Amino acid sequence: MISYDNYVTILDEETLKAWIAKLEKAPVFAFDTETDSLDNISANLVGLSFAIEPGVAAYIPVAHDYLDAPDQISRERALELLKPLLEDEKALKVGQNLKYDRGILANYGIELRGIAFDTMLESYILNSVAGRHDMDSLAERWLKHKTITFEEIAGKGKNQLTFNQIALEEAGRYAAEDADVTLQLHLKMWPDLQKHKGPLNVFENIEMPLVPVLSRIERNGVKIDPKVLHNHSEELTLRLAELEKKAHEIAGEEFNLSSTKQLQTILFEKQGIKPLKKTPSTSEEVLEELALDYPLPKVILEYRGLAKLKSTYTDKLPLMINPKTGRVHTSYHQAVTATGRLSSTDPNLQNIPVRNEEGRRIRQAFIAPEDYVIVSADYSQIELRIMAHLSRDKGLLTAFAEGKDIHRATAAEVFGLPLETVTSEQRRSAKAINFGLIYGMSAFGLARQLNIPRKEAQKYMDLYFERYPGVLEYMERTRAQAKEQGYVETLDGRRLYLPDIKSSNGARRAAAERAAINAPMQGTAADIIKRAMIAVDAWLQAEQPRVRMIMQVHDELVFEVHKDDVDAVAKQIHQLMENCTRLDVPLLVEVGSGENWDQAH
Ligand SMILES: [Mg+2]
Ligand SMILES: [Zn+2]
Ligand SMILES: [Zn+2]
Ligand SMILES: [Zn+2]
Ligand SMILES: [Zn+2]
């Protein structure tokens, strides 16, 4: 049990200064902040904690304001004394999710530097799939220690206290422990992170440097027009009502638009084969097949899609506008995906329909402020370019080299015809093959997505490998090492461990084999994207142009650029992204602009 004896609670300047002197001479030290809210931009700093040595940590309360709270060093006074140490790049800090802390300090005009180690990222790089990378999971896994939970000191539910309401000593136990455990986690993980130069490279030159740039992107936020979203919502209400009628009219009587309940009784009772369509989903979607002739499955399908879209983005997004900035601040997660790509929540920018018009209207609500424009920088089919590289296939490589449509170039080879004559259907077949190879799909899967008979798909795949031998060889070679070393790597050294690579369980070992093939391409795309963000942010920081990096979604970086600077800036972003990241993968950056994200997209 952590008691009040473990860690000191600093309530006087003299003591704070004595600690600052020790921190200044420490090789590294844990740093952590506590606030009155999870919302970074509007959160108020309530206290700070530090750990200079395992078991030696302190909590410095500055804004606890409960009834009769003891005198504390003022927030302004503690920060001005701590500022030098915090802004000193030579003073190395260790922390758990330093992105958050860096942000809090920015609310006070303090630029946290010396952001050297993030235990969350140390864990994530050691083994992205070992388990959760939050401090509590980490303490238990590496230290066989159970940390004091936030709920344990603040309570639960709507009546949960905010940190400023917690007693100084209780808060200190929690906060000082955070710092102490963080330092101990570091001391155990950092040595380990050195058994391999690949992961070490990714941690050092990619993950750690990205910490402050993610903070700036999140705190910058994005401008959303709540009027547009609202009109969209109202229109969606009217369209949903109409579709309900169109469905009723195509059939008889009223009824809900739910399968395996009301739909199967209409759809099939009036002809059609019995198996219902599960929302499994992207492998045998019964409703969408029928859609080619049967009108009911078509409107029901469109009904659900719009209803889901309305409640997820049209009705939620406007509620996410932060009253303090008038903008929306998405949460990027740097240590969640198995492959290394950044994830996003509230909102999940990546789940906004890409090839759909309604998705297009959602994006139209993402606007540029007055006298600025939204600029979108996209890495054209970066994963396919990466597979071309990893497979050393002169064919694909040449196709990209001469600027040809790889799907049409591929079709021209698989189907044997001039590139100019390749039809839309052949392009669509090659495209499915290409992107199927990335996710390591089966000839049968290709068929279930192409609506052709099995072995007809197998035919297309055998033709592809004959013409593109390098891709099969890459695949066979990748699955080989996956079983040999238990993991696959990206170009920069990032690893994906594959525990079920020998699962004995067919389904599991199947999955592990698909991940083996995919991770290297998806992970490398991610590494490239992260390196670009770092390079672009560095230019932004150094030159201070009139541009803000506001989003990262899929393989694109989105900015706000002043209308009078678009040309010079577009050129610069372009050169940074395709010429200041990896020089081996043939990269192409497509840059666009407009009044909103949809226009620039
Ligand atoms: Mg191909
Ligand atoms: Zn903490
Ligand atoms: Zn992609
Ligand atoms: Zn996109
Ligand atoms: Zn270029």
Which tokens sit at 549?
A: 């990096």
What sections of 71-207 are H helices per DSSP? 75-87, 98-106, 119-126, 135-143, 150-154, 168-192, 197-202
Using the mean position of ligand 1's atoms as its centre, give its distance from the Cα of residue 228 in Å: 40
Give the containing element (helix H, strand E) for 482.
helix 469-485
Q: What is the rounded CA–CA span in Å between residue 296 and residue 306?
A: 15
Residues 506 and 600: beta-carbon distance below 8 Å:
no
Distances (CA, A) of 146 to 9, 32, 142, 311: 22, 18, 11, 39
Ligand nearest to the CA of 588: 5
Where residue 95 falls (left for φ over 0; alpha for ψ -120 to 50; beta otherwise) is beta
| Same domain as 203, residue 277 | no
SS (H, E, C) 496-512: EECCCCCCCCHHHHHHH
Q: Which of 331, 351, 370 is the last residue of a domain?
A: 331
Q: Is the peptide bond before 347 cis (omega within 30 degrees of 0)?
A: yes
| Same domain as 225, residue 290 | yes
Using the mean position of ligand 2's atoms as its centre, give its distance from the Cα of residue 144 in Å: 19
Between the two ends of the chain, the Cα-to-Cα distance in Å is 54
- DSSP character at residue 162: P
Using the mean position of ligand 2's atoms as its centre, give its distance from the Cα of residue 34 in Å: 5
Using the mean position of ligand 3's atoms as its centre, give its distance from the Cα of residue 210 in Å: 20
Using the mean position of ligand 3's atoms as its centre, give its distance from the Cα of residue 435 in Å: 9
Q: Which of 525, 549, 583 is the last residue of a domain?
A: 525
Ligand nearest to the CA of 574: 5
Q: Where are the beta strands (DSSP E) in 480-564?
A: 487-489, 495-497, 547-553, 556-562
Contacts of residue 7, Cβ cutoff 8 Å, sequence gap at least 6: 57, 58, 59, 172, 173, 176, 177, 180
Which tokens sit at 75?
A: 């927030």
| Same domain as 543, residue 407 | no
Using the mean position of ligand 3's atoms as its centre, give its distance from the Cα of residue 528 in Å: 12
Residue 513 belongs to domain with CATH number: 1.10.150.20
Instruction: List phi, psi (to 5°) of 298.
Output: -70, -45
Quickly count: other Cβ atoms within 10 Å of residue 501's Cβ: 22
| Same domain as 29, residue 173 | yes
Using the mean position of ligand 2's atoms as its centre, give its distance from the Cα of residue 30 in Å: 11
| Same domain as 114, residue 36 | yes
Q: Which of 525, 557, 575 is the last residue of a domain?
A: 525
Q: Give the total number of structural domains in the chain.
A: 4
Count of helices and strands (H, E) across the chain: 24, 16
Q: Which residues surround ligand 2, an ion (CB under 5 A)?
A: 32, 178
Q: What is the rounded CA–CA span in Å between residue 297 and residue 41?
A: 45
Residue 429 structural domain: 382-525
| Same domain as 172, residue 23 | yes
CA angle 382, 385, 388 (to 5 degrees): 155
List for the chain the helix, strand, coil content (%; round to 5).
Answer: 50, 15, 35
User: 93-95 and 115-118: which strand pairing?
Assistant: parallel
| Same domain as 566, residue 438 | no
Ligand nearest to the CA of 528: 3
| Same domain as 296, residue 181 | no
Q: What is the rounded CA–CA span in Å between residue 218 and residue 284?
A: 38
Nearest to 49 by CA among 162, 153, 171: 171
Residues 560 and 594: beta-carbon distance below 8 Å:
no
| Same domain as 26, residue 142 | yes
Distance of alpha carbon 347 from the chain centroid? 11
| Same domain as 171, residue 228 | no
Nearest to 56 by CA among 19, 90, 1: 19
Residue 590 belongs to domain with CATH number: 3.30.70.370
Contacts of residue 238, Cβ cutoff 8 Å, sequence gap at least 6: none
Ligand nearest to the CA of 355: 4
Using the mean position of ligand 4's atoms as its centre, give its distance from the Cα of residue 226 in Å: 22
Using the mean position of ligand 1's atoms as its centre, give its distance from the Cα of residue 438 in Å: 9
| Same domain as 471, residue 574 | no
Distances (CA, A) of 349 to 74, 332, 344, 352: 39, 10, 6, 6
Q: What is the rounded CA–CA span in Å between residue 208 and residue 22?
A: 25
Residue 64 belongs to domain with CATH number: 3.30.420.10
Method of determination is X-ray
Q: What is the resolution of this structure in A?
A: 2.2
Which tokens sit at 53?
A: 């040595």
| Same domain as 119, residue 7 | yes
Instruction: List phi, psi (to 5°) of 421.
Output: -85, -15
